[PDB]
């Protein structure tokens, strides 16, 4: 059922790498080198995703060669997603998906590993893995490997629910959405491209884990809200809330924006707590998190990926300013880390 999106609140300014044209050229030449398409129409659709632009908005100060290298990960993701999930009217079986997806996880870890059957664009996954990780630090490569595996595992969970034709509970959605969207992998690629790496102490600290998870969750709720209208021409926050509260998709909208603002409000409180004492690496991650929030909104409605959904405008204030913890025990612990 059709929904009316509400305006988005974001207290950060738009930002974009001033060498975007060069970044996009490197990416289009790479798309053609590895032929990440079966026909000219697929090629045009892949370029129209503007994966280089969203990374360039997240990395406005990074070397354009390195922004191009990490954007290959997103172009590969889009190309492979469109292929694997458009493979017949019958939903992909988890038991068929799992043996393929662990092979892709292995190639992200160690591209010298090869298999008796490989899907198209596996050569491209090897190439982008070497391009991204060869120049990185050992610590950055360890983060790349763990976050890629977590995203592949999360994709598996989405396949499980699609096979069952079922909708997860709101608590289970709020636990897993950060994994199904791969935002930890996104953050790992920001570190590699921009040249930062958290200390083990910071990365493990419960306040920084709450910062990363709250940011990952609200960013992917924005993704869900932008992709709904287009997805309706066929596990979205709208569908999950509608089932949870036994209400219509339109009735779910104010609930979705309340959850969005409460999680982004918590993110801002943790940001305010951590910035004063933050070292150069945590400062760089927080900057990347701010730029990603704007990047999703500024690219999401102009990109051909997600008109089906007109930009609903900018909110002069958040939709929900309550500082109280959300009543979802998978994520309620985040509110314990506020100083």
User: Rounded distance, CA 289 to CA 267, Å?
Assistant: 10
Helices (H) and strands (E) in the chain, counts: 14, 0
User: Rounded distance, CA 15 to CA 224, Å?
Assistant: 22
User: Rounded distance, CA 193 to CA 59, Å?
Assistant: 8
Burial string for 9-30 (b: 16+ CB within 10 Å, else e) reads bbeeeebbbebbebbbebbbeb
Beta strands in 222-271 (DSSP E): none
Q: What is the DSSP letter of 85?
A: T
User: Rounded distance, CA 249 to CA 240, Å?
Assistant: 9
8 Å CB contact between 214 and 334: yes
Domains assigned to the chain: 20-337 (1.10.600.10)
Burial string for 276-314 (b: 16+ CB within 10 Å, else e) reads eebeebbebbbbbbbbbbbbbbbbbbebebbeebeeeee
Residue carrying the six token digits 């949870």: 244
Contacts of 7 (CB under 8 A, 6+ apart): 312, 313, 314, 315
Resolution in A: 1.5
User: Rounded distance, CA 149 to CA 279, Å?
Assistant: 28
| Run of H or E residues at 58 | helix 51-58
Experimental method: X-ray
**Biggest distance spanned by C-alpha atoms of the chain:** 56
């Amino acid at each position: 059922s059709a929904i009316e999106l509400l305006p988005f609140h974001c207290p950060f300014a738009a930002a974009v790498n001033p060498r975007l044209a060069e970044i996009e050229k490197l990416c289009v030449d790479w798309i053609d080198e590895f032929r990440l398409y079966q026909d000219d129409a697929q090629r045009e659709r892949l370029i129209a995703t503007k994966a280089a632009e969203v990374y360039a908005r997240a990395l406005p100060n990074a070397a354009p060669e390195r922004v191009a290298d990490v954007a290959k990960w997103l172009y590969w993701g889009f190309a492979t997603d469109d292929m694997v999930y458009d493979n017949g009217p019958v939903s992909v079986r988890a038991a068929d998906f799992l043996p393929l997806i662990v092979q892709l996880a292995r190639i992200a870890d160690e591209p010298r590993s090869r298999f008796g059957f490989e899907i198209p664009y596996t050569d491209a996954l090897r190439d982008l893995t070497v391009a991204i990780t060869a120049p990185a630090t050992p610590g950055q490569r360890i983060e790349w490997r763990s976050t890629a595996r977590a995203w592949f595992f999360g994709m598996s969970w989405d396949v499980a629910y699609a096979e069952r034709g079922e909708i997860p509970s709101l608590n289970d959605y709020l636990m897993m959405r950060m994994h199904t969207g791969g935002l930890a992998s996104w953050a790992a690629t920001l570190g590699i491209a921009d040249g930062f790496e958290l200390s083990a102490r910071d990365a493990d600290s419960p306040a920084v884990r709450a910062l990363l998870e709250s940011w990952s969750t609200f960013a992917l709720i924005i993704n869900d809200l932008m992709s709904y209208a287009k997805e309706i021409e066929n596990s979205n926050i709208i569908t999950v809330i509608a089932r949870e509260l036994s209400c219509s998709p339109q009735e779910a909208v104010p609930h979705a924006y309340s959850i969005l603002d409460r999680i982004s409000g918590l993110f801002l409180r943790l940001r305010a707590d951590l910035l004063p004492g933050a070292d150069q690496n945590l400062r760089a991650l927080i900057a990347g998190m701010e730029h990603t929030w704007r990047a999703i909104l500024d690219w999401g409605f102009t990109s051909a990926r997600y008109p089906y959904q007109v930009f609903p405008g900018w909110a002069e204030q958040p939709h929900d300013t309550s500082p109280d913890p959300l009543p979802y025990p998978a994520i309620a612990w985040w509110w314990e880390q506020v100083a």
